[PDB]
């Protein structure tokens, strides 16, 4: 016939005239139908810019199509003359016959058509389909039930996802698979697209992606000297613990660290863990990487608090080292601390915010939390910040057996300019941090004095307990005592310190006491003397009382010995280790260290080249090590989610791009990245980048993915009731960015050259080696074991009557013969 409801066919099968996935189609999705009419009698042909929602043509069932035209005829386009009116669709429903719900849908379209003209466009229309689909539960977004993530599984609709790996949860003590250690052992998802670090392939990309770090400025051709030392590893709870291995691997392989605590050493890396099954997880690997101790807790819960506080001999057993004797090297597990980190901050801030703007909108400017914040941080009686900051650092810079981390916005106001403004704890952190490296060395033991008043000694370089003679030079004018309390109406009192039987009859410094206004280093206006003189057994007595101010609340005392001039304590690394299948091992010469995190979630974006994080610290690269900073932690370099809250460098797109000049990070270029390390280097340091193989976040690419709705563990879960499983997702999966293109997998050549061992051993939860023969160019489903939910639903793919998949045959998509529903597609059907 020359005319008819024939021209609803696509004006081509194929993607130029219909938007698909993938070769999937979607009931948001739109097509360009040959023609299209008004009344049923005329029909005129489309031209490209006429295109119509596949929501008026195909429907996942005939309930929906019923409840469409009701709807629509209730929302405006009722039209008596074509048989629509409120009344006269009202029974329409499920049970209706297929013939009549076609025919009246068809006239509905006439009077979509009729409005369109009307108004000479579709976006009514578009709006009061998104308006429909919402009303349906199988159709709005909801469908997908929040909150949490989906895992992607084998399907043949999907075959091009497939995988034979997603092993979830393989995390700490469950690499192997058998969960049996009835204790806390992590899970797999955070938040974002959840990469899969037990896939093979996926595994030796990220060799790939370590040994360019480990070059990076070489490699691109920018500072020769600018590359890498070692790793933070993000989100060690939540990856294939075979990465942990397979990392320790390709640094031992690299550089020689097994035999050696000095190469050891100098390539220092820690993981991110608040899971104390890691310490026993990490004993049992000879140690590839520091374990982050929770005594960061212990102290914000003893000295912290605003007054509700855990009796003060929390600080001797709240760590995975008790500190009440500790006089041996070598026995406790290698372990980083801290007082502050950027996500400790962010839980204060966030949560502040929650009281500024009730649980409701942060995507906005409720900043002044910071200036409530560090108004707050200057008081007395301070409602929301860390009470004893400088207390809590002088605990954790004279404890044995760790390495400790300074938070950049504890010496900073980390919301300013980068390192523009000082904190108000400073100098006293500064001058803590200086003092470690020139007196903590030997054994510790803190001993409660009276009820809330705690006495940490460490005896000095080479004096092991309080009855060494001591063995180092350095040994009779070395050592420290940390007197601290946390009641703030203590009373005056006379106490003894056991300095060590080394320094009977010395002569000891008031490094740091209390006053009240705040803090002394002078002894000016506070309980002792600048100098005080022990007995001949070593004993000092020492007067303290309570105090209540921005700095102690409570007491903070700190003596060392008097000296002639600058020495340092810090004991050099052995060149062969006591026992060899150790990577590091927690003794002096590791307890020598001190990492310095440079970066806050809140760091701001910096207003000019100068003003960048990268350059900044270049300059500054000297002032890092007069502080005894000896390990940099940088912020993660890679190129960000560009509508991410913090533009921190965890929500990233491309692993290998770590910023260009016309495009740089928060902290700037790779240029001034290698430089800055180059700048570190000759100041003495080493340095570690964050490294992210969790997540990926903001990947642009669609993909037609099959999914099944699980908790956290990656195991499916019911949500109210209701759960879902092997259902089609549209989901936002498919990226990497250029560097993912041109550097992914770039290395793996040589790294099989070279070191062999790496793809020839074993991984623990796969048995299987990683596998170089495949480059990692783009991330794509397959390599991913999932994603958090992407507000997309779950019920848009279509599927025609006979229960299969539309599909829609594409160059690129080949996996099924072209099927199209009969209405958009099949001459044959509109022939009756
Ligand atoms: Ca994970």
Same mark, same amino acid.
């Given at each position: ?43 005129? !042909? ?306 502040? $915010?929650?009281?500024?703007? !009730? ?30 900051? !400088?207390?809590?650092?002088? $605990? ?18 980390? *919301? ?122 070593? $004993?000092?007595? #020492? ?72 350059? *900044? ?88 993915? *099959? ?11 019911? #949500? ?113």
């Amino acid at each position: 016939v020359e005319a008819g409801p024939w021209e609803n066919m696509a004006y081509s099968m194929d993607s130029n005239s219909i938007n698909n996935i993938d070769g999937y189609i979607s009931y948001t999705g739109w097509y360009r139908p040959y023609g299209t009419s008004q009344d049923g009698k005329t029909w005129y !042909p489309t031209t490209v810019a006429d295109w119509r929602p596949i929501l008026m043509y195909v429907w996942p069932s005939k309930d929906v199509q019923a409840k469409f035209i009701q709807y629509f005829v209730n929302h405006g386009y009722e039209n008596s003359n074509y048989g629509l009116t409120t009344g006269s669709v009202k029974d329409l429903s499920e049970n209706t016959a297929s013939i009549k719900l076609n025919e009246v849908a068809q006239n509905l379209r006439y009077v979509i058509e009729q409005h369109i003209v009307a108004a000479k466009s579709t976006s009514q229309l578009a709006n009061d389909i998104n308006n429909f689909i919402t009303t349906i539960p199988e159709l709005s977004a909801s469908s997908e039930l929040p909150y949490g993530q989906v895992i992607f599984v084998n399907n043949d609709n999907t075959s091009y996802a497939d995988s034979k790996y997603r092993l979830m949860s393989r995390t700490i003590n469950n690499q192997t698979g058998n969960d049996n250690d009835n204790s806390d052992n992590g899970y797999e998802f955070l938040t974002g697209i959840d990469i899969d670090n037990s896939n093979p392939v996926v595994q030796a990309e990220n060799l790939n992606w370590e040994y360019f770090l480990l070059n990076y400025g070489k490699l691109m051709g920018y500072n020769p000297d600018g590359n890498f030392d070692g790793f933070r590893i993000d989100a060690a709870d939540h990856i294939d613990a075979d990465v942990l291995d397979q990392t320790g691997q390709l640094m031992d392989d690299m550089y020689h660290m097994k035999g050696n605590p000095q190469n050891a050493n100098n390539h220092l890396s820690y993981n991110e863990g608040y899971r104390s099954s890691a310490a026993r997880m990490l004993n049992k690997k000879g140690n590839p990487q520091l374990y982050m101790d929770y005594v960061g807790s212990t102290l914000g819960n003893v000295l912290g608090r605003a007054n509700n506080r855990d009796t003060i001999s929390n600080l001797v057993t709240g760590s995975i080292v008790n500190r009440q004797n500790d006089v041996t090297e070598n026995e406790a597990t290698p372990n980083w601390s801290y007082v502050t980190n950027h996500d400790s901050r962010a839980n204060l801030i966030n949560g502040l $915010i929650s009281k500024d703007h !009730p649980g409701a909108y942060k995507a906005e400017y409720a900043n002044q939390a910071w200036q409530e914040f560090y108004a707050d941080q200057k008081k007395t009686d301070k409602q929301y910040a860390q009470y004893n900051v !400088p207390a809590q650092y002088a $605990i954790l810079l004279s404890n044995k057996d760790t390495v400790p981390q300074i938070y950049y916005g504890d010496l900073y106001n980390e *919301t300013a300019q980068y390192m523009q403004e000082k904190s108000i704890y400073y100098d006293a952190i500064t001058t803590l941090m200086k003092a470690r490296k020139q007196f903590v060395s030997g054994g510790q033991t803190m001993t409660k004095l009276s009820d809330n008043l705690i006495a940490s000694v460490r005896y000095g370089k080479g004096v092991t307990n309080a009855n060494s003679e001591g063995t180092d030079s350095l040994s009779r004018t070395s050592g420290m005592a940390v007197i601290v309390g946390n009641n703030p109406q203590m009373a005056e009192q006379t106490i003894s310190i056991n300095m060590g039987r080394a320094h009977a009859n010395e002569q000891y410094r008031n490094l740091l006491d209390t006053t009240d206004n705040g803090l002394t280093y002078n002894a000016d206006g506070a309980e002792n003397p600048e100098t005080l003189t022990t007995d001949d057994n070593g $004993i000092l007595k #020492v007067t303290v009382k309570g105090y209540s101010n921005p700095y102690v609340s409570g007491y903070l005392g700190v003596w060392v010995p008097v000296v002639s001039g600058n020495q340092d304590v810090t004991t050099n690394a052995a060149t062969v280790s006591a026992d060899s299948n150790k990577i590091f091992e927690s003794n002096a010469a590791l307890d020598s260290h001190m990492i310095y995190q440079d970066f806050s979630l809140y760091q701001p974006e910096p207003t000019s080249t100068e003003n960048h994080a990268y350059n *900044t610290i270049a300059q500054n690269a000297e002032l890092f090590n007069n502080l005894g900073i000896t390990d940099f932690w940088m912020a993660p370099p890679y190129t960000q989610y560009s509508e991410s809250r913090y533009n921190d460098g965890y929500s990233v797109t491309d692993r290998y791009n770590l910023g260009t000049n016309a495009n740089p990070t928060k902290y700037g270029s790779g240029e001034e990245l290698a430089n800055a390390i180059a700048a570190l280097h000759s100041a003495g340091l080493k340095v570690q980048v964050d490294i992210v193989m969790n997540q990926m976040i903001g990947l642009p690419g669609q993909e037609a993915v *099959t999914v099944t709705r699980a908790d956290n563990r990656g195991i499916q879960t019911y #949500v109210n009731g209701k759960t879902y499983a092997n259902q089609m997702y549209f989901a936002y999966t498919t990226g990497g960015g250029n560097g993912q293109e041109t550097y992914g997998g770039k290395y793996l050549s040589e790294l099989q050259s070279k070191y062999p061992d790496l793809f020839t051993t074993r991984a623990i939860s796969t048995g299987v080696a990683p596998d170089p023969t495949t480059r990692i160019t783009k991330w794509s489903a397959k390599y991913e074991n999932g994603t958090s939910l992407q507000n997309i639903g779950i019920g848009l793919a279509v599927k025609l009557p006979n229960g299969e998949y539309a599909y829609l045959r594409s160059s690129d998509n080949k996996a099924f013969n072209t099927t199209l529903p009969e209405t958009m597609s099949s001459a044959d059907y509109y022939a009756n």
